[PDB]
Amino acid sequence: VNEFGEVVPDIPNFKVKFGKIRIGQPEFQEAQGQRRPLYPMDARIRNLTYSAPLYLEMIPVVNGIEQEPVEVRIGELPIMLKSKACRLYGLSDEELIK
Amino acid sequence: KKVIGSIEFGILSPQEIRKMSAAEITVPDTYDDDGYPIEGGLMDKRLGVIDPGLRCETCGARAGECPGHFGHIELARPVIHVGFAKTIHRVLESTCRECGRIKLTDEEIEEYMQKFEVMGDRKGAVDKLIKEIHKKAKERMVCPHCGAPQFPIKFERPTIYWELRKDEEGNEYKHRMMPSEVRDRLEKIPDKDLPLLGLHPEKSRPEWMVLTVLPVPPVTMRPSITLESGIRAEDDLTHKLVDIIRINNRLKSNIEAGAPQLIIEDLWDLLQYHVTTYINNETSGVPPAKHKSGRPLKTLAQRLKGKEGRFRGNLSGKRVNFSARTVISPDPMISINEVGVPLAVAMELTVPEKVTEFNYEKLKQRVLNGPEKYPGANYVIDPEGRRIRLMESNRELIAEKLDIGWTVERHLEDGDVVLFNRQPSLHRMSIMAHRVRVMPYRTFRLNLPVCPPYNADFDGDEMNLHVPQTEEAQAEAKILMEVQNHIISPRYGGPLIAGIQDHISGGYLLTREGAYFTRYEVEQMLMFAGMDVNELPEPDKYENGEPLWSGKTIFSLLLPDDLTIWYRNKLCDEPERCEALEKLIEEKLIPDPEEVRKLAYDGFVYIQNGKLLSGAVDKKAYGREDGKLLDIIVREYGVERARQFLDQVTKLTIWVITHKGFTTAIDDEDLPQEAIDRIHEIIREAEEKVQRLIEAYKRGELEPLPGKTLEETLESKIMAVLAEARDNAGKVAERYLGMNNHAVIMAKTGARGKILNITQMAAMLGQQSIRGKRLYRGYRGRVLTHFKPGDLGARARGFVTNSYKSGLTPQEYFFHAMGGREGLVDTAVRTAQSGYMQRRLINALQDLKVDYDGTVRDPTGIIVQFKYGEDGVDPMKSWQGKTVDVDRVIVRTLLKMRGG
Amino acid sequence: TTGIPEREVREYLMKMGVVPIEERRPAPGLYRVYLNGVLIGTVEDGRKLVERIRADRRAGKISDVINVALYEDEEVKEVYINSDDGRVRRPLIVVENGKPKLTREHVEGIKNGTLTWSDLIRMGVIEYLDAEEEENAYVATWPWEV
Amino acid sequence: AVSDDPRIQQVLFDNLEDASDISTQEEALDYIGRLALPGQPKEYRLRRAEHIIDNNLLPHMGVDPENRRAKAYYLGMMALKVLELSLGLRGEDDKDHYANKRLKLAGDLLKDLFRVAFGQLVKDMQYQMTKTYQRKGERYTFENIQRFVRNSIRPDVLSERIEHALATGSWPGGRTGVSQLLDRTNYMSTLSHLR
Ligand SMILES: [Mg+2]
Ligand SMILES: [Zn+2]
Ligand SMILES: [Zn+2]
């Protein structure tokens, strides 16, 4: 992201500078939107994509002056099992059975 | 009911495309969209039916029995065909413009009329004659009839043409040639010049090469693939033909209203380009017209060709019916020409039977029994042609008067000829008609001696049979292709279907000196090996312990009554005691079998009058390579005798190897202590001789070889020392361990063994090389990182010194994996080069027959070889290159006459 | 190998005697310290500098993914430093003047719950070789023959 | 730029002087534009050789024409290495030795798949700002970008490119077969497929 920075639109006045990224816990919203955490045995049994949402804030630059950053989610991202970012990391023996 | 005599080729005239075509297509549209696929254009405008709608060009013609029909496109601009373009260029630069002549003198007109009838036969000789005409017409600029009218220089590469014309004095502007300008020139050539080229005045006019009207391929060649349930995947031919008509439509409007004269010429080339991919997508200098997802279009040239096209993929090689494919598993209890068939596969393959007069009692029962119980039928056929499936709810009303002439399809039974196949189909003999026998399990069975023709083994392979049906194609399989006709091979004469692993090493245990069988064991094995003899095992030759026989006379019941053969085999370790036996034989032709012959050996086979007096049977009497006791029984006593010599030997030999034991435990590889110290003094001094020869190179005492350089002489000398060391230690072990364990019995006679890998299991493993070089790949001057660098010693550059019993240490084991991976690469590499090399030789040589007067002739009638193969004996039946074999004949005929 | 920021290694060599490209002649100066394929700097004595980095790695000052190989041609001399992210390595035990380092007194510590593999490579007894540092080594096979 | 060793230096004057009297300075830059296409391009002449050199000659040093001073030293060093092997000063380098054969794996591969999918989402974002500025004109000034940004994204463009390239194994760089389904029979064979 720090390669791109500000690029365009065509109007000379407004530009957008890119901020930082955070990665949320693996969750999934269906139709009639409702967000609950996924659990990989459930995500290999009804054809899902075990994934996490990708939040990215942007900087509205009005003639130089930065005044209010808004965080917009861009998309989703697949996530590796038993990695540091998924829900099974450091999780004890009697719970992996659960 | 005629047949095709000859096919004559040519070019379609544009006049004939209109008369052949039934409709012109003017609507650039396929479906538009997802409902009512009917237009006034490319779909069924009385053009071709693919739907269940009966509308065609007035002829009914539902989709079953409907030939598709051709449409045409009135192209507004003339269009160069792609395939002719290299040969249109040969015409344009070799003609005098504006009149039509040939740019030749009157001498060559009268000479090359006359040269046509002289060379009127061979294709290759007249093809060079048409190139020199192109050569002589290029280097002339003065015609005899137009006064040199400023000939321009033509041009090519790849498709766009030009001319180099002068206007003021000497200009070199590249005037682009128009396709309309070309076709106007071609019409001015008179028809008499077409024999002077390679053309024909009624079938190939040159002006017809320029596509003025493009024909449309039919509906039956362009199907409509459905994707999920109602979505139609457009065909690759359909997708480009729609896009041709929409670039036409605008072009028609462009020249009818627009007049800027510049975009036209730009548009002109788009038309050309867009149909050019449709003939051949994979030309050079042309971007591939892709499908709009990332796939190229398989156009006509990819439909014709491409390693799976429509000469080899679907026309001369097709997928078949009435077959099966499963795994194999041995049994040595059926005859040599039978086969097992599982009972599930036997009820899903059928023969037609055509009840005449004498099987009518049989096939009444086969149709009364249903298609469940194993004698049963599936499909009955009336003489009209309406088949009647039998399965449903009654057969009694079909088991009525069966009306002689019908055709019943029943299951396979014991007797119906099948074929068999291995699929890699290398040589002539890997398809052979067997004789079905039905046994309940799920594997094809196969007699053990018939497994060097198929080149198979039994670690889960796959063999496929396929029943032939019509009564002419079935009697060809039984007479010409049964197993017993193929007992010898056409590559070297020697027998091919013969004994294998147990049949050899069992036969050595029967004819050893000391093989005395008791009375119960003789009587039991003669019943088991097929044969039928009465109470004459006589006469109880050694009653010293008990009344028990010898091993020779149980083997001397299988031979015919007047054999006479004597030869030397592999077990001869003392040539002097064979000599003595031979000497008596050559001077006193018939001695007495009692007295002198009990001076015998175990390495000189001698049979007379069907009685083996002296010998020991090994792999010189059977075998995949030469055995001259099955060999001399197929040339003297028919063939049908030698299928029951090999059927009775096989079951006799496996009996004695079963109830006598042939185990091989771990102590068979073992050497006592004093023999092992004999080996270790060899390995010590052989390493010291290596260490000395490095010192000669290091101090400048080179002693060079003439061919190689000093680095290459060193490596040469070393390997010889190492070789000798391993061969000298192989001789120590072989001398010591006796011929009484069950690991050298398998190696002397020969059945899956050598005398290398029994002394590569209690001795060295030699050096360890890789395609001739010694092991050198690795770090900078050291193969593994356990060795001091700058070292060329034996132990440090690929040389193991421990057995497969005394353990490999991790540098030696890692040296052995390097030599082991070299063997596995060269299996999959060498197989693919031989397969393509066979396709050249079959397809160049498959035309040749042998006529009745003994002459091999090509398809053109040119005699290739008189009196076939340096006349004239079949290599299947010649003996070892030679002919009639007088030598054996003389001895055989004299013996029989004199002996009486 | 995992990865490390490059700039920390660049600053670290500059005070240890690296004479940069501004000064080099170079030949024949027994020179050319490389870094991930990039040529930066020159040092004078090969035997002083290639032992200096390895002795520092087995103390704990520099990070643990750094490994120095030397090239000893008759006329050419290169000093290689490798700090990329995709190499393949292998563990060995340092020997020193004939004695295998860290004998039994640590092995009961490994057998007990005191220390582990995270502690042995920090204490400087296990060494990760590349394919390239392993060129200079000379490795035994058993503890008997050392 | 090449070397200062005198034994190398006398060889370089032979290859220099043999062709130095054909083309002079700053005219061979134009001659590369003569070679790639003919017949007085002029506008294609200057401009393609400026486009080739800044984007094909050694891109790991930079893309700016400032960086051309550094690329002369790098390519000067490769022409060094050809010419001490002709004399004999090193040995041949084998391209199997694991000193120069690295392994890019699932951390480094998946960053390349992210670069293409994020670069295509930014270019699709900018099209939805220019085709909405005029259709509605002017709105709340500081709340423009608080409402222009969140409506001009349509999140599904990013995530499909991530999934479909890895559920088929055909990545936009050119690699094929980089996603093989996990072989699952008998625990020794799932573990061996992860190595
Ligand atoms: Mg097999
Ligand atoms: Zn029709
Ligand atoms: Zn003329």
Short mmCIF file of C-alpha atoms in Angstrom, two decimals, chain C:
data_model
loop_
_atom_site.label_atom_id
_atom_site.label_comp_id
_atom_site.label_asym_id
_atom_site.label_seq_id
_atom_site.Cartn_x
_atom_site.Cartn_y
_atom_site.Cartn_z
CA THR C 1 15.42 -18.58 6.42
CA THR C 2 12.82 -16.00 7.44
CA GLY C 3 14.08 -12.47 6.79
CA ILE C 4 15.58 -9.39 8.45
CA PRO C 5 15.76 -5.66 7.61
CA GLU C 6 18.71 -5.00 5.33
CA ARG C 7 19.68 -1.54 6.62
CA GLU C 8 20.71 -2.79 10.07
CA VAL C 9 23.41 -5.02 8.56
CA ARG C 10 24.67 -2.19 6.29
CA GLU C 11 25.33 0.14 9.24
CA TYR C 12 26.87 -2.67 11.29
CA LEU C 13 29.66 -3.50 8.83
CA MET C 14 30.66 0.14 8.22
CA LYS C 15 32.24 0.61 11.65
CA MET C 16 33.96 -2.81 11.63
CA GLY C 17 36.50 -1.82 8.98
CA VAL C 18 34.59 -1.74 5.69
CA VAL C 19 36.31 0.72 3.34
CA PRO C 20 33.63 1.71 0.79
CA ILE C 21 33.58 1.86 -3.01
CA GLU C 22 34.77 5.51 -3.04
CA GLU C 23 38.32 4.43 -2.12
CA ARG C 24 38.88 1.06 -3.83
CA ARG C 25 41.47 0.55 -6.57
CA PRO C 26 40.55 -2.58 -6.23
CA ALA C 27 43.01 -5.03 -7.72
CA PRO C 28 45.06 -6.66 -6.46
CA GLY C 29 43.82 -5.68 -3.00
CA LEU C 30 42.27 -8.82 -1.39
CA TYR C 31 38.87 -7.19 -1.15
CA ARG C 32 35.23 -7.39 -2.34
CA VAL C 33 32.91 -8.08 0.58
CA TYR C 34 29.54 -8.85 -0.98
CA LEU C 35 26.04 -8.56 0.51
CA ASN C 36 23.10 -10.42 -1.15
CA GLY C 37 24.70 -10.00 -4.58
CA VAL C 38 25.29 -6.27 -4.15
CA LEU C 39 28.95 -5.24 -3.98
CA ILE C 40 29.57 -2.83 -1.11
CA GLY C 41 32.90 -1.96 0.46
CA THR C 42 36.38 -3.45 0.85
CA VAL C 43 38.34 -4.79 3.83
CA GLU C 44 42.06 -5.38 3.95
CA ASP C 45 42.75 -8.64 5.81
CA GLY C 46 40.50 -11.59 5.03
CA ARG C 47 41.46 -13.75 8.02
CA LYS C 48 40.75 -10.98 10.51
CA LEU C 49 37.29 -10.09 9.22
CA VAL C 50 35.76 -13.50 8.46
CA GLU C 51 36.51 -14.77 11.97
CA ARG C 52 35.29 -11.53 13.52
CA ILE C 53 31.68 -11.85 12.36
CA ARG C 54 31.43 -15.56 13.24
CA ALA C 55 32.79 -14.93 16.73
CA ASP C 56 30.23 -12.17 17.22
CA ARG C 57 27.34 -14.39 16.08
CA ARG C 58 28.32 -17.02 18.66
CA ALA C 59 28.22 -14.39 21.41
CA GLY C 60 24.73 -12.95 20.89
CA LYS C 61 25.30 -9.36 19.73
CA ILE C 62 24.23 -9.65 16.08
CA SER C 63 21.00 -11.40 15.09
CA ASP C 64 21.03 -15.12 14.43
CA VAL C 65 20.50 -15.23 10.65
CA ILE C 66 23.94 -14.15 9.31
CA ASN C 67 26.54 -16.51 7.89
CA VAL C 68 29.94 -15.77 6.43
CA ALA C 69 31.76 -17.80 3.81
CA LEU C 70 35.22 -17.22 2.41
CA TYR C 71 36.52 -17.93 -1.08
CA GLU C 72 40.19 -18.83 -1.25
CA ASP C 73 41.35 -18.91 -4.88
CA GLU C 74 45.08 -18.58 -5.68
CA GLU C 75 44.59 -15.04 -7.03
CA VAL C 76 40.99 -14.08 -6.18
CA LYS C 77 39.46 -13.39 -2.78
CA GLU C 78 35.80 -12.74 -1.98
CA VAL C 79 34.05 -12.43 1.38
CA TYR C 80 30.38 -13.41 1.21
CA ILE C 81 27.59 -12.23 3.53
CA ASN C 82 24.10 -13.63 2.99
CA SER C 83 20.93 -11.99 4.31
CA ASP C 84 18.02 -12.88 1.97
CA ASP C 85 14.78 -14.69 2.87
CA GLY C 86 14.61 -17.98 0.97
CA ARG C 87 17.72 -20.05 1.63
CA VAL C 88 17.77 -23.64 2.90
CA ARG C 89 19.90 -24.42 5.94
CA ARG C 90 21.05 -27.29 8.13
CA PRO C 91 22.07 -27.64 11.80
CA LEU C 92 25.50 -28.75 13.05
CA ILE C 93 27.36 -28.68 16.38
CA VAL C 94 30.49 -26.53 16.70
CA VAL C 95 33.67 -28.39 17.57
CA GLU C 96 36.66 -26.48 18.91
CA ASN C 97 40.31 -27.62 19.16
CA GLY C 98 39.31 -31.29 19.34
CA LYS C 99 36.54 -31.20 21.93
CA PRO C 100 32.82 -31.23 21.06
CA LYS C 101 31.30 -28.20 22.70
CA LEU C 102 28.65 -28.39 25.46
CA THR C 103 28.85 -32.01 26.60
CA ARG C 104 26.67 -33.88 29.11
CA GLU C 105 25.98 -31.01 31.56
CA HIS C 106 23.56 -29.46 29.07
CA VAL C 107 22.16 -32.78 27.88
CA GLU C 108 20.51 -33.47 31.23
CA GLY C 109 19.30 -29.89 30.96
CA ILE C 110 17.70 -30.75 27.63
CA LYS C 111 16.42 -33.98 29.19
CA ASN C 112 14.93 -31.93 32.02
CA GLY C 113 12.63 -28.96 31.55
CA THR C 114 15.25 -26.27 32.00
CA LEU C 115 16.36 -25.22 28.51
CA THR C 116 15.57 -26.07 24.88
CA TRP C 117 16.56 -25.45 21.23
CA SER C 118 15.75 -21.78 21.66
CA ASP C 119 18.49 -21.60 24.30
CA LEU C 120 21.22 -23.66 22.59
CA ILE C 121 21.54 -21.43 19.51
CA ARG C 122 21.68 -18.31 21.72
CA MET C 123 24.39 -19.88 23.89
CA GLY C 124 26.45 -20.59 20.79
CA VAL C 125 26.75 -24.33 20.32
CA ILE C 126 24.43 -25.04 17.37
CA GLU C 127 25.23 -23.36 14.09
CA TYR C 128 23.06 -23.01 11.00
CA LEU C 129 25.07 -23.38 7.81
CA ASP C 130 23.98 -22.39 4.30
CA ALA C 131 25.06 -24.20 1.24
CA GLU C 132 27.72 -21.48 0.96
CA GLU C 133 29.29 -21.37 4.45
CA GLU C 134 29.41 -25.17 4.43
CA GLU C 135 32.05 -24.98 1.69
CA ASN C 136 34.70 -23.93 4.24
CA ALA C 137 33.83 -26.61 6.82
CA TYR C 138 35.19 -30.15 7.30
CA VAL C 139 32.61 -32.26 9.07
CA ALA C 140 32.98 -35.47 11.08
CA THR C 141 30.34 -38.19 11.22
CA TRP C 142 30.50 -39.66 14.71
CA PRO C 143 31.70 -38.43 18.10
CA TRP C 144 34.33 -41.20 18.04
CA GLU C 145 36.54 -39.74 15.30
CA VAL C 146 37.21 -36.07 16.07
#
